[PDB]
Structure 1
Amino acid sequence: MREIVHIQAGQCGNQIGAKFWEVISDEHGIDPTGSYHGDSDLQLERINVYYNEATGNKYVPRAILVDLEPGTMDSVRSGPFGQIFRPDNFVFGQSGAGNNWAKGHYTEGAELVDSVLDVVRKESESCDCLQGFQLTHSLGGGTGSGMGTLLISKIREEYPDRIMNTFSVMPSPKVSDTVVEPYNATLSVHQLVENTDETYCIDNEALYDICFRTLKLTTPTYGDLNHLVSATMSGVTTCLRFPGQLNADLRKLAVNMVPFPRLHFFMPGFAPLTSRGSQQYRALTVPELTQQMFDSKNMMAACDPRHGRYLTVAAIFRGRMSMKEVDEQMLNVQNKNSSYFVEWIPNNVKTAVCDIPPRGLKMSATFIGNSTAIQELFKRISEQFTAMFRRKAFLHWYTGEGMDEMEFTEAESNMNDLVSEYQQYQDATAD
């Protein structure tokens, strides 16, 4: 029954992974003990995608929790829903990665990886028909970045015919001052380009700017940043968790969204944007929903969608609304904004509508775009990487772990190639 295995690695991966489970649990009527208490049958129809049914009619997330930082286990277990997670699915080390990709990928991470693979093997074999995997992690640290990409690679060896999907948090010096974050992110992107089928680019630069400029928060905290992350993750997974026709599984989503294998980095967006504690006085109209979710101020990646073209788009509308009005509005943005949509992929914008809205909203909309403007995110990381790399800055922290400088050169070149490929398709014409 199309099961997904969820994996959360590192401090960021576990923080956003926990919020994902707290949020989707509420939507499905599942309390922290695993009991169901809802009104709608749509809540449990596809509960199997993310939850295992344990004895006593309980539901337990098909989630594996990983971190080299031992202290992460306590913070996850102490969360509102820490009780729901399978105890044996918590795999924690004693020595962290110290913001070092090489430690997470090659040394401390490699020491712990077989313990994680044992637990993913067990969840995977228990599946009636496994779809693939979903990894939440950051790219700026050491565990989520290095060990997360090591896990992806090992999982790909045993399950090569399954979808590998990630929620990858991109670093921004606006939220983190760690000097080596561009190194860790470039090394991770190199891995993601080769080994994932679809990746959602949750950019800390866009999240900080949404909180500061749009939500008017003088100093956004990780809670503020993560409110946007969970709201995004709920929206982008709605099609997988509820009964529907379009993009109902990770494979059908990838066939619709990815025309060229490497070009699988999605720009997520949502509407209405809200802060924690902001009440909704009235529901947005379908034209407000459609206009806002396509707005650059609503994107979760710091890229201007009007600086590129949309290869493909998935629009998900949640709540009770007119489908005729939705269709009209979706045709309206494409006909009015025709120059930001590739003309050589006919009917590249697919729209789904789910009757169940998210918490505190009567109407909402989530956007998923595969845009050539995503090169703005990669160019920003590449520039930061190059500034340090030309000075051979901080390399001993990586080569001291056994790494070769040639790996940095290879990763830089691969990400720069990815950027040229987006530009090639942006300039392509339907001759």
Structure 2
Amino acid sequence: MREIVHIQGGQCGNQIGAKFWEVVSDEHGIDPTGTYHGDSDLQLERINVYFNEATGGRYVPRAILMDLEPGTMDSVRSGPYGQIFRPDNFVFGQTGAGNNWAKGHYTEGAELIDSVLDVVRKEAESCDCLQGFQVCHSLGGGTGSGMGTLLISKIREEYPDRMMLTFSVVPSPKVSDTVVEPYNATLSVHQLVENADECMVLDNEALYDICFRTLKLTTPTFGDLNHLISAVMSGITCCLRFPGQLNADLRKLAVNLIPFPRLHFFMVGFTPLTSRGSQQYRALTVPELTQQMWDAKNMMCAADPRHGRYLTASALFRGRMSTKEVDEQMLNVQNKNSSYFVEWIPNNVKSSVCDIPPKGLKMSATFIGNSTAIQEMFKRVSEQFTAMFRRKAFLHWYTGEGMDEMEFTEAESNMNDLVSEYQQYQ
């Protein structure tokens, strides 16, 4: 019954979503031609959450691409598994985003977002009992933040009763792609903290540290990073596709995690992440999957939880396991690390178990924490913002497109008060 529509904003979001759809197609057992060639019926019992039967098995994904150039769209078509999306959903302008927040939120947004809303509304009305929205984008660009964030706002205003998952690749200081990343990040979080319901925050710094330490890769190109982000977004919502011993809907996860309506930024990791060499030696049972889950170096975020406190955690296990074992694991972890936890919330950990492990693996787990140490990214981005806003550097490219200083100050103040809200509870 319940289903999720998906949107891939910008180049980063588009490639992450393409890998996500490859992962989902592999898990559900369908060919790149669209036909079903899996093995069991538990997967095709609930494919309607992400796919639609078109004509005789040619399942079509329920996602919409979105950018301002045709090159990325052509790349995703030419890549494997790119021959399944509906061509009516390849919405894209032609002029060029220019990695500019104004150019992706005030001109090209105003010239293409009526169409993107039209197609997403068509899909959301084709699907019967909506459950939420899923969006993939980066908070360091122009059309990653502008286009995607304006779409988030419009969709929130139009369907203000559906849980929303926005997956945001926040900029990281060491991997500095462009020059206006702090500006875009500020102007994007200003709207996310106000409209969108939860963003899972990820970063390339930790996505590389994981690949260098745990995976022990030699030359990790973007394929492996997108693979990890996929394997996270695939297991974020499995209680829908597959039965479970203790199910957990997306709304249940949201209500257990978010204590106050403005503390909804989730820092996420996945287990097990075993190197190709040491996997044959490694042992995989619950009281080491949980140890790696709470390992501070497995987190896909450059904010060590030992620098803050945990408000709430969520552990989604996959596979046939022992629920009492899981619960004693969480309890003894809390008692061992009582200091890292908030006092006025008993049993800060919500645990869920699903009955179908991923392709090949026999046990798996996903961690979603709401720690108050995530204020570090916002503090750093605000510092990088105010390093440039004192001298109005690179500001005429937004002033000429029609944004004052008032909204910049608003966004910076929003970040500052958000940091204050995290810090006060801690």
CA distance in 2, matches of 1:110, 1:241: 36
Could you say which residue in structure 2 is the equivalent of 1:230? 230
Task: Spell out, residue by residue over 1:342-383, the C-alpha distance to the aligned partner (whole angstroms, 9 max, x if none).
Answer: 232233311112232223422221101111111112112112
CA distance in 1, matches of 2:392, 2:254: 38
Could you say which residue in structure 2 is the equivalent of 1:405? 405
CA distance in 1, matches of 2:85, 2:252: 29
Could you say which residue in structure 1 is the equivalent of 2:148? 148
CA distance in 2, matches of 1:280, 1:223: 20
Which residue type is aligned with residue 363 of structure 1? Answer: M
What is the SS of the residue equivalent to 2:269?
strand
What is the SS of the residue equivalent to 1:143?
coil
What is the SS of the residue equivalent to 1:244?
coil
Could you say which residue in structure 2 is the equivalent of 1:36? 36
CA distance in 2, matches of 1:343, 1:241: 36
Task: Please list, as runs of the form range in 1=range in 2, the aligned pairs for 1:58-73 lying within 5 A after superposition.
Answer: 58-73=58-73
Could you say which residue in structure 2 is the equivalent of 1:280? 279
Partners of 1:172 and 1:204 within 8 A in 2: yes
Task: Spell out, residue by residue over 1:123-152, the C-alpha distance to the aligned partner (whole angstroms, 9 max, x if none).
Answer: 011111111211001111111111000101
Partners of 1:46 and 1:241 within 8 A in 2: yes
Could you say which residue in structure 2 is the equivalent of 1:329? 329
Structure 1, 340-349 or 298-307: larger mean CA deviation: 340-349
CA distance in 2, matches of 1:397, 1:258: 37
Partners of 1:96 and 1:143 within 8 A in 2: no
Partners of 1:2 and 1:249 within 8 A in 2: no
Structure 1, 9-18 or 348-357: larger mean CA deviation: 348-357
CA distance in 1, matches of 2:35, 2:249: 25
CA distance in 1, matches of 2:48, 2:210: 34
Distance 1:302 1:207, change over 3 A: same
What is the SS of the residue equivalent to 1:194?
coil
Partners of 2:35 and 2:58 within 8 A in 1: yes
Could you say which residue in structure 1 is the equivalent of 2:392? 392
The offset of 1:326, in angstroms, is 2.1
What is the SS of the residue equivalent to 1:165?
strand
What is the SS of the residue equivalent to 1:260?
coil
CA distance in 2, matches of 1:232, 1:197: 19
Could you say which residue in structure 2 is the equivalent of 1:429? none
The offset of 1:159, in angstroms, is 0.7
Structure 1, 199-208 or 243-252: larger mean CA deviation: 243-252
Task: Spell out, residue by residue over 1:29-49, the C-alpha distance to the aligned partner (whole angstroms, 9 max, x if none).
Answer: 122222222223321232222
Structure 1, 257-266 or 228-237: larger mean CA deviation: 228-237
Which residue type is aligned with residue 119 of structure 1? Answer: V
What is the SS of the residue equivalent to 2:165?
strand
Could you say which residue in structure 1 is the equivalent of 2:198? 198
Name the count of aligned residue pairs.
Answer: 425
Q: Does 1:46 align with 2:46?
A: yes
The offset of 1:242, in angstroms, is 2.2
Which residue type is aligned with residue 346 of structure 1? Answer: P
CA distance in 1, matches of 2:240, 2:416: 33
CA distance in 2, matches of 1:278, 1:238: 29
Task: Spell out, residue by residue over 1:62-121, the C-alpha distance to the aligned partner (whole angstroms, 9 max, x if none).
Answer: 101111122121011112111111110110111221111111111112211111101001
CA distance in 2, matches of 1:204, 1:407: 28
Partners of 1:318 and 1:364 within 8 A in 2: yes
Which residue type is aligned with residue 106 of structure 2? Answer: Y
CA distance in 2, matches of 1:222, 1:163: 29
Partners of 2:206 and 2:301 within 8 A in 1: yes
Give % identity: 89
Task: Please list, as runs of the form range in 1=range in 2, the aligned pairs for 1:19-418 lying within 5 A after superposition.
Answer: 19-217=19-217, 220-244=220-244, 248-274=248-274, 280-281=279-280, 282-418=282-418
Partners of 1:247 and 1:256 within 8 A in 2: no
Partners of 1:68 and 1:109 within 8 A in 2: no
Distance 1:40 1:347, change over 3 A: farther
TM-score (norm 1): 0.93
Structure 1, 172-181 or 117-126: larger mean CA deviation: 172-181
Structure 1, 249-258 or 214-223: larger mean CA deviation: 214-223
CA distance in 1, matches of 2:66, 2:247: 29
Distance 1:328 1:293, change over 3 A: same
Partners of 2:20 and 2:227 within 8 A in 1: no
CA distance in 1, matches of 2:274, 2:31: 24
CA distance in 2, matches of 1:340, 1:386: 31
Structure 1, 413-422 or 227-236: larger mean CA deviation: 227-236
Structure 1, 316-325 or 304-313: larger mean CA deviation: 316-325
Task: Spell out, residue by residue over 1:156-198, the C-alpha distance to the aligned partner (whole angstroms, 9 max, x if none).
Answer: 1211111121011111243343011111111111111011111
Distance 1:88 1:267, change over 3 A: same
4+ runs deviating over 6 angstroms: none
Partners of 1:207 and 1:225 within 8 A in 2: yes
Partners of 2:242 and 2:355 within 8 A in 1: no
The offset of 1:58, in angstroms, is 3.1
Partners of 1:164 and 1:195 within 8 A in 2: no
The offset of 1:321, in angstroms, is 3.0
Structure 2 unaligned spans of 5+: none
Partners of 1:51 and 1:62 within 8 A in 2: yes
Which residue type is aligned with residue 422 of structure 2? Answer: Y
Partners of 1:10 and 1:69 within 8 A in 2: no
Structure 1 unaligned spans of 5+: 427-431
What is the SS of the residue equivalent to 2:82?
coil
